């Protein structure tokens, strides 16, 4: 879909933050919660996490 | 190259290289004599491969060179052929590396951001590389033209 | 920097006096006149790349012989330097409107220009064809205000009077 | 020498820029209180003959070894020079308050004053106190809080010119330290 | 021929300022001519009198209370029967010029003060002084100055109309004549009572010796060191206030210089100097990747030129033309402005900025190591393991003395 | 991350006092320019790609950082630039709306000059790109709005220096 | 070969590792304010 | 300052000798090609106003940051100043070729140019590039291998004076480094 | 200067009001005679501009070979450095008088002074004359027995502060001997 996290690919490719930081920021992103948080239940969100 | 990413593949998997990986590093280095001959043909044919490359490019895309086109005038047309000299050079790297890894991280990664940010029609530069491919494969036999053309069309694929 | 301050603190410093009422009165003129001459410093800054483009080709439309080989504008690099120099003279006029006097022109562009244009064989009449085209392209209430066109032109033909 | 108009010119020459819309709001605000600056220079130069005797004699009652024999305010020719450089410094600070930039302070007054005062044998720490009483007076005159002469003014805030003239005396007091 | 004639020849007929004084540091600062008008207001007579007292006394405090022998020599000038040359001769014959710069002065300090006061320049060579030494000792001081201002020097470069000034004359007949100039006329602050040290040797600031430095530079051919010609300096007073990317003004000398800071800085300025000499051989041809196709891309692009405005219609749309000199080559506003942004973006210029920036940091750090025995050090760095040894036992460099006791 | 109102409230709160006449005096000064900042941030959002295309072509397009060996040679390296210049034009837009440059050093300036030295990115060419980008931004938003947007560009250039 | 080389690996690299020493985000080595001054030996009264 | 005859006189006055026939074989050979020295130094002086603009602008095309604002050859004062010392150095080298002895170069042109160019902020590596372009031109005009101008000369060899004018240009390179 | 007596810290967020772990007992005990010590340093530093000029001219007029040319105080750089170093020495005794101990003086001022003055050719026999004048000057000022200047102190005694400061001056005077 041509999505882009240029800031996060910045701060991970330089090593400014870990992959774990890049993964956590991806989880709190809004393109995530629009994908795997909004259409589901808090019950189903826990398993998909 | 095939040597460096066959390593980093088996590197990530916490293992050594299989026979499938080591019978191809073996098969690639015996192929190395034939690769340098192929790259040696394109090395001192850049005068014709580029100039005839931009030959068909303007006949097929007169908009880019017409007044208003991105490569208009004596100035931009020189740079119009400069990029073709770049991409013709990277294909010589890919032939000797046995992979588009040199072409990948040079001239392909984020190429649409550059040409979109330069105002250049990215489809137009793709047409230029295709015109160079017919000139390049016309300089080699059938066994070689399946390789030298093979790296151009990968560059065509990633450039659109 | 020949300005309205640096004549009243250069003549008082050579005299050895405090800034008296004759010198505070001169900078009261730097409040009334500078409402207009900064407007011509702002319109020239926001439209500089189109002014030099409209002016620098009048150097070559009038004198078409410069693109001949052996002459001054013979190749690509020497044409770009010829458009660079009219951008310089349009930049110091923007510096002179914001200083208040002819300070950045008499020190940075004018002084020594008759020794470099004779040594490098540049025709200095080709420079004033570009500046006097800019003076006559000036519509007075369209480009800027009525007073800001006075201030912008009076540094322009001062620069013409320097080069000729 | 420069002023507050041509300091942002040679700053804009450092980036090869035109003086566009970003920098002219720094200068149109500078001529917005241009009537305030001339009301601040006029408080300095109207008491400038009295401030220099107020400040040199304040240095004497603190460090009285200058007028002691062998000192540096003992000889009467040597006293009359110390009243002169109290007011040449006040002449060049008042040009720096007028121009709005301390270039004429740092190219004409302080241009070699440090090796002057070494080679004349002038005590440098007393030259700080000759300067800094004029700092504490000019910030009292510009804020109009001088405790024995109030000047008439249209009322309003003036504390930026007070810290501006305190910034010009600290460039004098650091360059001769 | 960039400069047609020097300042020592007079200005011929067709200029108001001489050709060397146009593009020198004459025009920037206050070392100009303030030539007297024909008839003038007594305020304008005070202007030309105040410049004479600045020039021929050299910022000395003339103590306007007395002006004892002055007001006869003033009143000859305020009438008009004394020239400005004849005023500046008569001031150099008085007692208040003698008790400042002659009664305590060495004959090197006196000759180098008459070159700054009466003329503009410094003394150039050695035998230029040795004329004026032998002219004083056989004819006396009153016939010295009369034989000093009436040569061919003063009557051309100032005439009998203008006051003397510091002659920033552009062409300097030794190159050290600019160096001793700026070392004598020491900035806008220093006077010659200070510079010769006549106050500090004085008994209560009176009747002290006017001793001199720079006597070793007039005997032997030896330049002035650069700190006296860049710090306490008239070039700081007639400063252009540019953006000079190697800044010529020297930094103040730091407390607590370390040898660990210098020994990597000298290796850094050898690193840039060896890398500059490589990169300058590859300049302007092989660094331009678009240069190789300029012979073909400006003959490929010479097809279907358009003479009026309007064509390249391209199937029936407008798509017009610009037809100027610039955009017929396809260039833009970002194509002549690319020369102004050639300090970061260049490669040869990126070395030469940091070469002269770090050599200028070296020449004040190395010259701050003129202080050795009681100096308190510090360790601002984190005391790392990098350390050069003290192996200085036997000969390592040994400059070639092939005549060791040749006799 | 404080705007002009957040900074005014913080200083008035940090002394434990209410919002007196001086604190509200600056707040009224910020609300007066509230109309100017949005239109400034409006056009900058529209011409984001056009402004960055104008700056690089005007400052560092043809210099030898663009050529082989220069700091911007490969397409990944060139593409990182316009990605990198986008943040400067974007975060400067945030400072222009918030009226306080706290967001810049919070999210841009810290570890920035220490990062370019690691990669070997030329700080000299970077500032001139931002200076040229500041020059075109004064073209769009006008003079005073350019003075506002320009006031945060050189803040980046100062700290990045 | 250009003097201002760069960092990184793979193709398009100048033979210098990332960050000049293979560290992208370098841990600092400085101390705080008051004991950077304590080590200097000159800011003792301060 | 000296010339080529008076250089061997102070060499012979150091031992108080007469100028005998063993010494004079160089000086009698010096006037034997004295036609060639005037024929050499005419070719430099007839092209001297284009030799400087070939060289100072040839420094520019190698280091194009000097014409950027900041570089020391930017302002029309600075370019007219850099062209001015382009022809001061070319004047004294052509003086030194004419006298045949490097004394007039080293006490009048180069004595203290190094400390002068430090004080003005002139970059000292770029001035070697201005000198070495004038080094390659003066050995081209003397040997008549200039690739866009040939002058008329009598037939014969000239490379001794090409070597002598080459050694007068590296004295300029060694003085200011 | 300000480390010579201890301050108490009374506010929070300090980590010395609570986790100080000490009070400075060696310097709480010196405000038990602190006003008498602070008047004594005020007796020196209000005359320190005059005590250094009298003492340096004292050894000039007793040994007149220093201002002779060839001597070590004839030129202006050396005469300014000699007036500077007596001023620095008089400050460092006034640290050691204020702090009540000589441990500031021996490492910041005396550690490596005898090796310095023989590395510069400074006459060590004349510089100890220059501090014995300042030894005799300071005991006149602290005991208020100066002939030309008195100061209005309180009613009391200041011997065993005058002999304290006289014990620092020979401690200087043997560290350079
Ligand atoms: C800061 C200084 C500054 C100026 C002086 C003007 C100068 C100027 N005017 C025009 C452009 C124009 N200028 C005019 C105005 C006139 N034409 C005439 O012949 C009359 C004398 C006059 C009527 C008042 C018109 C009508 C145009 C558009 C058509 C044309 O080019 O003539 C152009 C070409 C670019 C453009 O289209 O705007 C330029 C540089 N603009 C500036 O930014
Ligand atoms: C401070 C203000 C400032 C200026 C005014 C200019 C002045 C100037 N122009 C040139 C240099 C030049 N200037 C021109 C200009 C022209 N020749 C032509 O074909 C036309 C007649 C005309 C432009 C319309 C050319 C072609 C050169 C290059 C000369 C050469 O390479 O021989 C140079 C020499 C260095 C260089 O730039 O290469 C200088 C100092 N530069 C400045 O920095
Ligand atoms: C343009 C810059 C400029 C200045 C800043 C002043 C300052 C100044 N003062 C003096 C000269 C002097 N200056 C002082 C001054 C002082 N000694 C003290 O103890 C006090 C701290 C201080 C007075 C406030 C004295 C005492 C002399 C006299 C020295 C003498 O006559 O021998 C001199 C040397 C002049 C000369 O004697 O020939 C200068 C340059 N004059 C200038 O032209
Ligand atoms: C031992 C001797 C001794 C003195 C003579 C005074 C001198 C003196 N006055 C002021 C402080 C000042 N001095 C003046 C000067 C003057 N007031 C005027 O109205 C006139 C213009 C001018 C006297 C002719 C002014 C205006 C102030 C600021 C406060 C005020 O008086 O209103 C200061 C600085 C503040 C301070 O350190 O206390 C000093 C040292 N104080 C002393 O300790
Ligand atoms: C030629 C000589 C010359 C001057 C002397 C000044 C004179 C001057 N001062 C102000 C005007 C003013 N001056 C002040 C300044 C002050 N008020 C204070 O309470 C502080 C004590 C002091 C600050 C330093 C203020 C606050 C105003 C009104 C606001 C303003 O006009 O800027 C004004 C504008 C109002 C009026 O018409 O009077 C003028 C003309 N301008 C000149 O052209
Ligand atoms: C008697 C012997 C003699 C010389 C050898 C020359 C050399 C010389 N040049 C300058 C002065 C200068 N010289 C340069 C020169 C250069 N800047 C560059 O980047 C280039 C590398 C170089 C020219 C090729 C510049 C730019 C100035 C002017 C600096 C200024 O105005 O501040 C000066 C100071 C004079 C003055 O500015 O008034 C001198 C002595 N002149 C002489 O009189
Ligand atoms: C970046 C721009 C640029 C230049 C300006 C030139 C500058 C230049 N010229 C020469 C080399 C030369 N330069 C000249 C100079 C001249 N020829 C003449 O006939 C005139 C008298 C004078 C021009 C007015 C001469 C005579 C030679 C020797 C070879 C020759 O041209 O015949 C050299 C050394 C060898 C070389 O690289 O070619 C350089 C750098 N080259 C450049 O790359
Ligand atoms: C008043 C001005 C004045 C001059 C210009 C010279 C002119 C001159 N040149 C030569 C003569 C000559 N000049 C040269 C020199 C050269 N030939 C070459 O092939 C080289 C290119 C170049 C060396 C740099 C040679 C080789 C001769 C012939 C041998 C000789 O006579 O020395 C001669 C002697 C033969 C003749 O009469 O023509 C004269 C008078 N003499 C003067 O008095
Ligand atoms: C913190 C403690 C401290 C000091 C005590 C001084 C000590 C000191 N004095 C001098 C340096 C000097 N000190 C003197 C002083 C004198 N020579 C005499 O003949 C007189 C007897 C005597 C004056 C009273 C002189 C003349 C020089 C300069 C030596 C020279 O230039 O030849 C130097 C060398 C560096 C410099 O020039 O300052 C040092 C470290 N400096 C310090 O930092
Ligand atoms: C040959 C030349 C020569 C001199 C220059 C003087 C210098 C001088 N004064 C004193 C001695 C002294 N010097 C002072 C100093 C001062 N007194 C004051 O009131 C002023 C504030 C301050 C000088 C500026 C004091 C207080 C004494 C102690 C004697 C006394 O009570 O006055 C001594 C030491 C005497 C001793 O040790 O017993 C010397 C050498 N005497 C000389 O023989
Ligand atoms: C939001 C604040 C912020 C900034 C500014 C930032 C910068 C940043 N710039 C980077 C690289 C880069 N930046 C540039 C930039 C330039 N080259 C030039 O010549 C010019 C001077 C300049 C463009 C103006 C280049 C070429 C790289 C790639 C370097 C490499 O591959 O080695 C990288 C490495 C990782 C990556 O790009 O994915 C980071 C993290 N990160 C941040 O979080
Ligand atoms: C090795 C991989 C690689 C590539 C490909 C590359 C491209 C590249 N192309 C450029 C310009 C350009 N490229 C073109 C190209 C074209 N115009 C047309 O009509 C055609 C469709 C097309 C060519 C076939 C033009 C006209 C410019 C100049 C644009 C301008 O001046 O605004 C520039 C800016 C100038 C320069 O530094 O050369 C770069 C960096 N760089 C790289 O490192």
mmCIF file of N, CA and C in Angstrom, chain I residues 101-130:
data_model
loop_
_atom_site.group_PDB
_atom_site.id
_atom_site.type_symbol
_atom_site.label_atom_id
_atom_site.label_comp_id
_atom_site.label_asym_id
_atom_site.label_seq_id
_atom_site.Cartn_x
_atom_site.Cartn_y
_atom_site.Cartn_z
ATOM 1 N N UNK I 101 45.334 29.719 55.986
ATOM 2 C CA UNK I 101 46.378 28.721 55.855
ATOM 3 C C UNK I 101 47.104 28.950 54.545
ATOM 4 N N UNK I 102 48.339 28.466 54.486
ATOM 5 C CA UNK I 102 49.210 28.715 53.352
ATOM 6 C C UNK I 102 49.121 27.639 52.288
ATOM 7 N N UNK I 103 48.126 26.761 52.362
ATOM 8 C CA UNK I 103 48.061 25.637 51.441
ATOM 9 C C UNK I 103 47.557 26.036 50.064
ATOM 10 N N UNK I 104 46.927 27.201 49.942
ATOM 11 C CA UNK I 104 46.550 27.723 48.636
ATOM 12 C C UNK I 104 47.761 28.353 47.971
ATOM 13 N N UNK I 105 48.663 28.907 48.775
ATOM 14 C CA UNK I 105 49.767 29.695 48.253
ATOM 15 C C UNK I 105 50.872 28.815 47.692
ATOM 16 N N UNK I 106 51.162 27.695 48.351
ATOM 17 C CA UNK I 106 52.331 26.902 47.996
ATOM 18 C C UNK I 106 52.167 26.085 46.727
ATOM 19 N N UNK I 107 50.946 25.828 46.271
ATOM 20 C CA UNK I 107 50.805 25.033 45.060
ATOM 21 C C UNK I 107 50.340 25.841 43.860
ATOM 22 N N UNK I 108 49.532 26.873 44.067
ATOM 23 C CA UNK I 108 49.075 27.677 42.949
ATOM 24 C C UNK I 108 50.007 28.826 42.626
ATOM 25 N N UNK I 109 50.838 29.244 43.569
ATOM 26 C CA UNK I 109 51.706 30.387 43.353
ATOM 27 C C UNK I 109 53.179 30.080 43.537
ATOM 28 N N UNK I 110 53.538 29.161 44.423
ATOM 29 C CA UNK I 110 54.939 28.925 44.715
ATOM 30 C C UNK I 110 55.479 27.633 44.135
ATOM 31 N N UNK I 111 54.618 26.724 43.699
ATOM 32 C CA UNK I 111 55.090 25.455 43.160
ATOM 33 C C UNK I 111 55.604 25.688 41.756
ATOM 34 N N UNK I 112 56.916 25.788 41.626
ATOM 35 C CA UNK I 112 57.508 25.968 40.326
ATOM 36 C C UNK I 112 57.705 27.425 39.999
ATOM 37 N N UNK I 113 58.117 28.198 40.985
ATOM 38 C CA UNK I 113 58.465 29.583 40.749
ATOM 39 C C UNK I 113 59.961 29.821 40.761
ATOM 40 N N UNK I 114 60.708 29.057 41.553
ATOM 41 C CA UNK I 114 62.157 29.179 41.558
ATOM 42 C C UNK I 114 62.755 28.588 40.290
ATOM 43 N N UNK I 115 62.110 27.567 39.726
ATOM 44 C CA UNK I 115 62.574 27.040 38.450
ATOM 45 C C UNK I 115 62.186 27.953 37.299
ATOM 46 N N UNK I 116 61.136 28.754 37.471
ATOM 47 C CA UNK I 116 60.717 29.653 36.407
ATOM 48 C C UNK I 116 61.641 30.854 36.323
ATOM 49 N N UNK I 117 62.016 31.404 37.474
ATOM 50 C CA UNK I 117 62.781 32.641 37.500
ATOM 51 C C UNK I 117 64.244 32.419 37.153
ATOM 52 N N UNK I 118 64.731 31.185 37.262
ATOM 53 C CA UNK I 118 66.042 30.899 36.706
ATOM 54 C C UNK I 118 65.945 30.457 35.256
ATOM 55 N N UNK I 119 64.746 30.143 34.764
ATOM 56 C CA UNK I 119 64.592 29.844 33.350
ATOM 57 C C UNK I 119 64.394 31.093 32.521
ATOM 58 N N UNK I 120 64.108 32.219 33.158
ATOM 59 C CA UNK I 120 63.950 33.478 32.462
ATOM 60 C C UNK I 120 65.047 34.469 32.794
ATOM 61 N N UNK I 121 65.979 34.107 33.667
ATOM 62 C CA UNK I 121 67.026 35.028 34.046
ATOM 63 C C UNK I 121 66.587 36.115 34.987
ATOM 64 N N UNK I 122 65.500 35.904 35.713
ATOM 65 C CA UNK I 122 65.000 36.883 36.681
ATOM 66 C C UNK I 122 65.937 36.910 37.882
ATOM 67 N N UNK I 123 66.420 38.093 38.319
ATOM 68 C CA UNK I 123 67.297 38.156 39.498
ATOM 69 C C UNK I 123 66.577 37.813 40.790
ATOM 70 N N UNK I 124 66.957 36.671 41.367
ATOM 71 C CA UNK I 124 66.273 36.163 42.549
ATOM 72 C C UNK I 124 66.645 36.950 43.790
ATOM 73 N N UNK I 125 67.830 37.557 43.797
ATOM 74 C CA UNK I 125 68.248 38.394 44.911
ATOM 75 C C UNK I 125 67.510 39.720 44.949
ATOM 76 N N UNK I 126 66.976 40.171 43.821
ATOM 77 C CA UNK I 126 66.221 41.411 43.809
ATOM 78 C C UNK I 126 64.736 41.200 44.010
ATOM 79 N N UNK I 127 64.213 40.028 43.655
ATOM 80 C CA UNK I 127 62.784 39.794 43.810
ATOM 81 C C UNK I 127 62.414 39.528 45.257
ATOM 82 N N UNK I 128 63.362 39.038 46.060
ATOM 83 C CA UNK I 128 63.102 38.870 47.481
ATOM 84 C C UNK I 128 63.160 40.198 48.208
ATOM 85 N N UNK I 129 63.815 41.203 47.621
ATOM 86 C CA UNK I 129 63.693 42.563 48.121
ATOM 87 C C UNK I 129 62.291 43.096 47.872
ATOM 88 N N UNK I 130 61.684 42.702 46.749
ATOM 89 C CA UNK I 130 60.376 43.214 46.362
ATOM 90 C C UNK I 130 59.244 42.665 47.209
#
